Design a protein around this ligand. Sequence first.
Ligand SMILES: C[S@@+](CC[C@H](N)C(=O)[O-])C[C@H]1O[C@@H](n2cnc3c(N)ncnc32)[C@H](O)[C@@H]1O
Ligand SMILES: C[S@@+](CC[C@H](N)C(=O)[O-])C[C@H]1O[C@@H](n2cnc3c(N)ncnc32)[C@H](O)[C@@H]1O
Lengths: 262, 261
Amino acid sequence: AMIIADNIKQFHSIRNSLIKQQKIGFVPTMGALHNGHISLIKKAKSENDVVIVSIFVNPTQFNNPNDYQTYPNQLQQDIQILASLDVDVLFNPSEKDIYPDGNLLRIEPKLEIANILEGKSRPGHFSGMLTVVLKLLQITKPNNLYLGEKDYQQVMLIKQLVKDFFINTKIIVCPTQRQPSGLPLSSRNKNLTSTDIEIANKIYEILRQDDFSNLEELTNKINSTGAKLQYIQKLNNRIFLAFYIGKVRLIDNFLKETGPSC
Amino acid sequence: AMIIADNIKQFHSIRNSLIKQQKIGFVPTMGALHNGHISLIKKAKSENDVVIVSIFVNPTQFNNPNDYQTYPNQLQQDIQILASLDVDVLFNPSEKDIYPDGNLLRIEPKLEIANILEGKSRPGHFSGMLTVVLKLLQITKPNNLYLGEKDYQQVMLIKQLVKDFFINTKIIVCPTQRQPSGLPLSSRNKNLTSTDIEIANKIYEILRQDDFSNLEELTNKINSTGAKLQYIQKLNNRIFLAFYIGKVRLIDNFLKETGPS
Ligand SMILES: C[S@@+](CC[C@H](N)C(=O)[O-])C[C@H]1O[C@@H](n2cnc3c(N)ncnc32)[C@H](O)[C@@H]1O
Ligand SMILES: C[S@@+](CC[C@H](N)C(=O)[O-])C[C@H]1O[C@@H](n2cnc3c(N)ncnc32)[C@H](O)[C@@H]1O
């Protein structure tokens, strides 16, 4: 029953066949679906008549080229997951569909929350992300856009994007889905080896015990587990941090009063 | 009977009151309307059922602060002109309307034609222009966009903008209106003095007699009139040039075979 649109020409046909009384929900992903994505999709199934899910590994938001090649790819598994959830339309475009002449016109963020944290650590990422989200919103034209809380700056920037370019879409932010240890579900965690999981469980054991009053002391407790902390910083009752376990980069953010709570 | 929407909310009211079965034509301007603008509006009137004209001196596309300060302002006469042209809606928004939180998210052109000619000579202008044009297209959502040929790179960049972000809008390119001497009509011409006008006529007296085989000799003939030639180049089949007379910046482009006819 689920419609799969491999290119933008077929999607335009599907999208143009919907009338203005149908509530349309849109969940953009880069595939490799986990319960974090599924929590977003179930939220959209309950508030909308039509749920569109996009799968597109956007090259322009990958500052690290090795990250782009080793990004998890499980398309057939994702289609099975999406069909199980009764998703109406899957939008799975190619690079030349979204960038017919390459990346010539780009959204550039010139504000503070784009210059710190993920933006400071990932140059060019937010520009690539914002450009493709605008393209996808211009394509899908949804009533409701669903975003995960795990990418907090991404949520804030897209909220600014929808406002500044007058897109008539409501943004629904969903809580981060976590393993019992507190580790946020993430597609890149597929690359984590056996001991790597044990290392990540050590860190969140620490994070759930710490009051985050001494961030330098906490940095040492984290690096002792074998991971390499990239940054950790408090920003408005909310702790942001990113670290490396092996060749896998992990990010997380959470309230200070709760920690990585379940 | 012309509606003057000076804020976003007011425009969304009249904009949403229109049927899909009404062809909407959009002519974005920065005010100081001249016959170049009037020709674009007349073209839109003859091809659409609703013609929307915007007037908004976009600050983020001015790389020169004095240029932005001295930009001609004549809102009352522009209203009279648009009314006599039977323009359906006038969109005259404020800076806060278009940039509620400032100029935070900008379109950046990483493209070849955005680095030569007016792009090199006016840093940041194209990024400011494309940002406000995208905003204006999101607000008005027309079927037809009407642009003048005098801003050639601007036309090509707006075509790329409409294609890259999937805006279902047709772009209509209209010819450059010119003084009898050949001097193109420009809103900044209103800042020229009476001797500035005489210099500009001598420049286009020179341009009409040149075969453009020697751009350097042409540059000296243009500088000897008192003006200051900023650039002059051949791009494919056309001549592009910009120059200063006093504090007034003037640009033009035309086919090499024809000149400013
Ligand atoms: C794989 S992410 C990346 C999408 C990509 N930045 C793009 O071009 O749109 C897709 C969505 O899933 C959400 N997500 C990822 N992990 C999540 C989690 N553990 N819990 C809730 N949402 C999550 C993200 O917030 C994001 O909105
Ligand atoms: C006031 S100009 C500046 C518009 C500005 N770049 C913007 O949209 O924010 C508005 C329009 O008038 C057109 N125009 C200016 N001079 C013209 C002329 N001499 N003949 C025909 N069109 C002209 C330009 O092509 C432009 O599309």
